[PDB]
Structure 1
């Protein structure tokens, strides 16, 4: 569930969010951040298990 949630937020974040005379605003690192969050969560769940 957390893996799906983080991937969904990452994909939904790359679209630009400011418009008109200034464009872009899409954080390019979001996919690497989501892979980092899910891969550091994995260690905690393996310790619990």
Structure 2
């Protein structure tokens, strides 16, 4: 829930004025990549239990 909230917040552009844009386009693929790397640590923690 924190990776999906940080991904959609970074898809909004943050630079305004005479030069617009600034949003990170690979934000959803960064977020889903961090969850699947963290779920590998969860399944190792559940296996150690």
Shared fold (TM-score, shorter chain, > 0.5): yes
Structure 1 segments, 4+ long, off by >3 Å, are none
Q: Normalising by structure 1, what TM-score? A: 0.91
What per-residue deviation string (whole Å, max 9, x for no partner) do you get for residues 1-49 of structure 1? Answer: xxx0000010111000000001100010000000000011000000000
Q: Which has the higher strand share?
A: 2
C-alpha RMSD over aligned residues: 0.4
2: CA distance, partners of 1:12 / 1:25: 12
Count of paired positions: 46
List gaps (5 residues or longer) in structure 1: none
Q: Normalising by structure 2, what TM-score? A: 0.91
SS of 2:16's equivalent in the other structure is coil
